[model samples]
Target chain A: AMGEITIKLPDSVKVSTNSILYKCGAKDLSVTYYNAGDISLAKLELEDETVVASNVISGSGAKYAGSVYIWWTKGKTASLYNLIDNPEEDKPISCVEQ
Target chain B: KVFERCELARTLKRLGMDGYRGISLANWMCLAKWESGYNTRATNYNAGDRSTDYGIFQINSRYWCNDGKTPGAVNACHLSCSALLQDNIADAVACAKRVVRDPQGIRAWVAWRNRCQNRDVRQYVQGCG
Candidate 1:
């Protein structure tokens, strides 16, 4: 709760270089950041765990239904992080980037 | 002169909207009551949308009327929007028929939807015809 940030999402996020893209199975979604002043997050984390950049291999015994995980690292690292949910695991999961 | 309820009903029946499904004389009378209070010269400027509803039917400037002042008007009935405000309601009737032909039919008029549709409105013109 203390480490995570809350974003006031806009009605529409226009595509730009600062936009973030995520792929969940065959579905894709995108979110864009318009102004540097719009975001006031100390860090981008869901459930207080720092999101690190990573790749999720397809058919690697991982299954995410109904949702996908996308992460972004702070300044100097443009790497994209991807995670998937596992129904077998009872833990809650969230993905965010800043 | 603004028509009494029965007088307006007679004119609408002559125009063949008497029992034309959604454009029944009862419904038309109800629409006229709410839109213009039977005043043919009615012109309502909607500040929210910067649009106008013209004539007895209160057709919108966005699609049906061309007041020159109403930007990007389609003039679907192909007549001057001010023509709707005239005492001669022939043009208004013709254009209203065209509007009903659209997929929305008489449902395009919000007044008819709220005050006339599906209710027992035969009393409006019940014994006149």
Candidate 2:
């Protein structure tokens, strides 16, 4: 079944936080399928099962640019073992110079 | 403009974390839209009592450059300005996230909205189903 994903933001909206712009900004994110091409391959049957997905991002290389967002989901009880730094919720995410 | 945004988007795809849920493009856009309106350089004004200052994400000019890691260089506001000019969207977002976390997530924002005559549109944003 198809489910929906939603994001909640603050009142102080800025250019980086526009929904339409975000819609257009979709070009920036990419995901690698693990085991197979689509997540459907996993066919999750249990909770807290780990899946392999890769996230890669690039900064626009403009000042105020180096921003990147990762996309991933797990069971409500799953925890991520980030392969790289800035993997945790409190970890500071950065825009790396490409 | 398209090339720049593509670059930014591509970066997110290549550098994001592992086991991420949701479509990479959709989630990236969600964060992009709320963080800076896609503006590399964005400013916000935060005021508490008599302390009103501004910086990228409105980080308060007083201690803006207080950190040795991100010295705003005399004019602390320059830190954010430079980040914007440099197209550091992720940094800006991180800064914004830190701000939100420091005061306590969306709850803190909701309280502030209660005090304001104008509430954030997000007041209506619902949870994921």
Candidate 3:
């Protein structure tokens, strides 16, 4: 694959917004994403509270971590974890975009 | 503390739950009537699941609140189950609102689904104007 390098740049650098609605079995979530230059953010919205997740390094997928939770998304699906409760990380609650 | 019929009705309406998220005051009243009999300090334990239901809303320890012994509680509401038992129902009401935010809406309660749903719930709020 060969093509001219693409660059997306804007003067403001404030932020751009995109949202995804995920069905996570017991509860569904609406996650809003924001990006500005090197910074990426995900706001995991639930009926209980809105958790802000910061992008973190990962072996795969876009891993985001909150104070006590994690929202990891790959392709069209996502998985959620509550670090405090399920410390083993053995199972992740699966989520898919609706 | 047991609440009088109309008293709980007026209280719930004032707390903004009358139609919060499309659930009516009568619906809440009916649920409360069946769940805890309008007793603020009421509590129930489910041996089958090893979880406790608290307050008028009967929020379960296994999910909504922490009761120290609920095997794998998520405590989604982020509060202790004890908070729901206070005589003042503000905390319980808030948790109830939070509970309905999930996919269940008000259907999360067994009594609400069994007794209130699709039934004439007007009697719960009648003469409470």
Candidate 4:
């Protein structure tokens, strides 16, 4: 069976892209969602910065990992966490769809 | 500071951006709208590589300008990254022109490729001379 292998390929086709505006505290956060065959991406743009994140495992909301942040969204609400800025006392900024 | 649409369009045209390296004024305007919303002081930090994108064009510190704090940057533009944030964009525009001279041309800007390429960008220069 090692000589002739039958492999099941993973689908990697692009799906769709969606842009949503969110009210994160006093700030406006633009969140762009991109979905491929088996992968999802998030492009988060704030007043001062922009970050692209990839999807991750989660029990409730959809979670994405950035270079130093985690963007978790549940329904119309979301939270952003900066793991590097506050290592010991991590707090997430709550966001609502607007 | 942020610029009004046609105001920026004419200004960019005066700065020799019209058909510069085959990139039209509308395309440049479209790129600026997406990159920094025509704000001269806009900036974006890339935590992935510790590089910062500065000014309306959102040029990065990695290969273009010397931001000092960026790690292992080449500074091919041979200017301080701070020059990009000035209200007068002469230096920034020169650097932008230099960026397109590379093999990537205008493709060096992901924002341009994503938002300006193959799109109906006439609205950016609409009603402008």
**Which stretches of model 2 miss by more than 4 angstroms?**
A1-98, B1-6, B17-28, B47-81, B93-129
lDDT of 1 by residue, A1-98 (tens): 59634445664543222345434334343433323221111122323344322211110011111124433221111222233453322222222222
Error of 4 at A86 (Å): 39
- Docking quality (DockQ) for each candidate: 0.02, 0.01, 0.02, 0.03
Per-residue lDDT of B1-129 in model 2, one digit per residue for the tens? 122444555555555511133223433333344433445444442211111122223333323323232112233223533453344445544444434433333222211222221333332122320
**Model 3 chain B: ten consecutive residues of lowest lDDT:** B43-52
Q: Native-vs-model 1 lDDT?
A: 0.54
Q: Which whole-number lDDT from 0 to 100 does residue A47 have in model 4?
A: 59
Higher-ranked by DockQ: 3 or 4: 4
Q: After superposition, how far is residue A2 of candidate 1 from its true place, in Å?
A: 24
- Of the two candidates 2 and 3, the one with more favorable lDDT, higher being better, is 3
Q: List where candidate 4 sits over 4 angstroms from the true fold.
A: A1-98
Clash pairs detected, candidate 1: none
Residue A72, model 4, lDDT: 64
Model 4 Cα lDDT, one tens digit per residue, B53-127? 789888877678888875546787898989999989898889889888866577566556545766788887878
Give me the displacement of residue A10 in model 4, in angstroms.
Answer: 39
User: Residues B73-123, candidate 1, lDDT per residue (tens digit)?
Assistant: 567888888888888788998888887776657756655654576678778
Q: lDDT per model, in order? A: 0.54, 0.28, 0.73, 0.73
lDDT (0-100) at residue A44 of candidate 4? 88
Flag the better candidate by TM-score, 1 or 3.
3
Q: Give TM-scores for every candidate, taking all chains together and pairing residue i with residue i.
A: 0.55, 0.27, 0.56, 0.57
lDDT of 4 by residue, A1-98 (tens): 48532334475454567888989888888888765544567888865568889865331135578888878664455668777875432356788789
TM-score of 3: 0.56
